[PDB]
Amino acid sequence: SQKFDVVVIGAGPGGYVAAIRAAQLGLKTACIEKYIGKEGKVALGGTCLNVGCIPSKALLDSSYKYHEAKEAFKVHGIEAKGVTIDVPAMVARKANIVKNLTGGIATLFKANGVTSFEGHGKLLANKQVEVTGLDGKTQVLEAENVIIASGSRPVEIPPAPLTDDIIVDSTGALEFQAVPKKLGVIGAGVIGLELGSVWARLGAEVTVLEALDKFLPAADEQIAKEALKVLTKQGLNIRLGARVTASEVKKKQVTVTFTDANGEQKETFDKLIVAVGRRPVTTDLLAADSGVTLDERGFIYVDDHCKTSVPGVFAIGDVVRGAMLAHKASEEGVMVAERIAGHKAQMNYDLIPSVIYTHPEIAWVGKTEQTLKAEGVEVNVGTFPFAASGRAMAANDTTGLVKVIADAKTDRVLGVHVIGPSAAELVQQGAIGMEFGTSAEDLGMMVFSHPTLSEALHEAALAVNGHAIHIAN
Amino acid sequence: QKFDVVVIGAGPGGYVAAIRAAQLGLKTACIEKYIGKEGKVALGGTCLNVGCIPSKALLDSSYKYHEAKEAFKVHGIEAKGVTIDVPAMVARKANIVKNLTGGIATLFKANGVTSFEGHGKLLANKQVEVTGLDGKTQVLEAENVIIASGSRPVEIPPAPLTDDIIVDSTGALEFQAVPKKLGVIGAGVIGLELGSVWARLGAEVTVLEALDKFLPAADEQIAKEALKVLTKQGLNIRLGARVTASEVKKKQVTVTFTDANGEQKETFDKLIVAVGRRPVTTDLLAADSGVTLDERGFIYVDDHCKTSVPGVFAIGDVVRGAMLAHKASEEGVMVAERIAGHKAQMNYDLIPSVIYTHPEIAWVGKTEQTLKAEGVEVNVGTFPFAASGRAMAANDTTGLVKVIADAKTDRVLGVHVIGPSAAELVQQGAIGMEFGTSAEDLGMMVFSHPTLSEALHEAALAVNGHAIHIAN
């Protein structure tokens, strides 16, 4: 009853996928989770399902539909009088989606034979896992293998500590019951831009204070430049080189002090979202005699196969090195489970795509132009704008472009970058090609359906070598 | 006077062939006769002027109206009243057409393509007679001719086009008001798309289809779901219903048709005839041109689109194969490259199909029923959008992805989708299939979460019984 082949600590994208895969492989598997959802019961799915990926995308989709009805219907002949959005109802839809999907994970666990434990797991020496239940009582599970998937939480900064319901992190930003009239966001990363977009669409006057001089430095510079222009026009007052140093709450508002190129500045908001990154969670996770070590940044140290310093103990997802993304965590979970089952399964960290769920959506896979320049790789670049896409014109959504980067000597595609409609789907097309070593000409030779947004990738690939049909080369 | 390449027709086949030929350094002419809305010749063929683009424009506008009327409350979005201005909707479509047709002329100018306005006829010895709009003729001496004369709607005596009451797809894209009761003959792609436009805007739509089987070219599982969903959307699709006569009186039309229960009648305010497409060869070939037609009226060509006359090629809807814009354009590229000396080939096995209903329907490769008829043992994996977190956030969970793989080699043989972004997910499958992907190959790749693409990933994993997010 206490013995398992695999004990997983955490039921986020890393842990719950690892648990399902382990069970599919015939391993007697347990998964421990402590997070309490909205109904007062344990809810699986981790950050991503409960306070992350899914909730944010739900509010992004609802808020965009309102925005389009208010600002982009007349051109179609559609007249909608007095369109309004009720924030409590919008948030309630998101909550219902979360409830359904978290229950869905429990259904998958049941179907696959995963044993769930409710409470806090702590790794002791020699792969024993102590579970403190919700009633405070402890039991020890004897594990042949342990998969640590304890995830992350928001970074906290002393200049902007969470305060009442006025200074919030991403979790509180997904729970506003009314549109903040003036909204401040600290951090112009993915989370800050997505959350700022939600509330700007519904009428908030949004300022985003970003300490770095460079916007979206991980994105391709051409993509980031267009993103900054478009998002600023949408009402995200993105201030670069602006570092918050202090805040003061009074009269149900918060005044932020920050330093920019022109010196000390102050700005007052009704709500302030702190979105300055995420940190790995190891709180009470490892006994002093567990043998598992942390790096200087607080991540659990693992090798390229996610194995810790302790045989039979693995760690995956946001608590270890690499991109802090849900699909990265889940793929690591699959790899670890398959390796426990005896398969020499491998993971490719080079083709993990990134998506920013603004509208226009931003997505990419592979290397940026600036990275390849720093590496000394000569490249050919092809782009195609959605302004030249018949499908995008029909959709009344022509902002953005597709960019394909190929090695100048071999024509191998090295990166695909998109800002525009269905960016993530077009990037996935590129990623599939790159898995097979596609050249730019390979993509150019394929039949792409017309009219589709995918044609923009086809034209960009042809443009790499100067023979796109529908733009000057 | 003299050209390396003379192209007859400026549709997706002809205009792309002309651009590519010019890019390859060939002195190229393109002849077109179609008169657009401004009274001048308009390029882009059926697809741009009265086909792909206009239909998708009305599909997108009508869908946005439909969603606002029927699927906003769940988001907390309330309206005091949503209405559609049909003249304004059609005018947006007309403006898109005008911009894109002008865009082709801009591309021709930038690439050095010489345009001729009028009717082109192939004479003997690769001479092309151009009859201008004033009836005057001139002869071009062509080293190579590319025939790209396209297609037009099929006509049937029981439903002849009549004023504005009985129309084909061209007239159906020009209604200035929502018909109260709308009849459609033919439940193919065009009938379903046009029926969808007007049903969304309030028309009571009946689709009369003579065949017993719905969407026979699609995978049967996809077609069954499509029939269910489209019927729920108000397309009263009547299978095994053959129209035999019609009668126009007092701005309405009564249709007579035969179904399993005998002779039936139904009356409509408007009737759309959508009973297929046929190749155009009208006055195209002199009797001694040397180019032959097959029994069905298509120009006879080999797999490189070469006719029975060396240096004369034919592409697009006027030759064999799927009557689709991307098929025509790729044939144009192949022919131009072959004229320039390259042994260019065309892949006829991975041409995708798309039906722009909502939910969208798309597929590439072979259906389950085709593979069973061929005796190929397969494994099938499916994943429903009801289990997609991205689709749930989008409030759009109808449909599924289906992946079919060879049971022995695991090679993916077909990908079929009904649901959001169907065409984009099918293109992902088609790219994989170009590289010979197995189902496990797709399963081992990292798919971004949350995205609609994950449904293809899960379906690929389901082929071999280890999808994560559905029971296996």
Ligand SMILES: Cc1cc2nc3c(=O)[nH]c(=O)nc-3n(C[C@H](O)[C@H](O)[C@H](O)COP(=O)(O)OP(=O)(O)OC[C@H]3O[C@@H](n4cnc5c(N)ncnc54)[C@H](O)[C@@H]3O)c2cc1C
């Ligand atoms: C607003 C926001 C939006 C995001 N949007 C996206 C997106 O769109 N796409 C994307 O790829 N990523 C997105 N992310 C990031 C994504 O959420 C993470 O990368 C992902 O959740 C990490 O998965 P994980 O399993 O490693 O960690 P987590 O999801 O954090 O799961 C860790 C689990 O372990 C539990 N736990 C921790 N310690 C213990 C313990 N001792 N005992 C028992 N249980 C424990 C926790 O309660 C939690 O459930 C977003 C993040 C945020 C904050």
Ligand SMILES: Cc1cc2nc3c(=O)[nH]c(=O)nc-3n(C[C@H](O)[C@H](O)[C@H](O)COP(=O)(O)OP(=O)(O)OC[C@H]3O[C@@H](n4cnc5c(N)ncnc54)[C@H](O)[C@@H]3O)c2cc1C
């Ligand atoms: C309502 C409708 C919707 C459609 N939607 C899609 C879709 O979404 N996706 C898709 O792939 N396909 C779609 N199609 C089909 C698509 O339009 C055709 O497959 C495509 O246009 C064929 O390209 P083509 O160049 O061979 O022929 P065409 O587009 O028909 O062009 C032929 C050109 O040649 C001209 N011509 C003919 N004879 C002569 C002559 N002697 N001299 C000079 N000019 C001549 C014609 O005026 C015409 O412009 C649709 C069709 C219809 C009717």
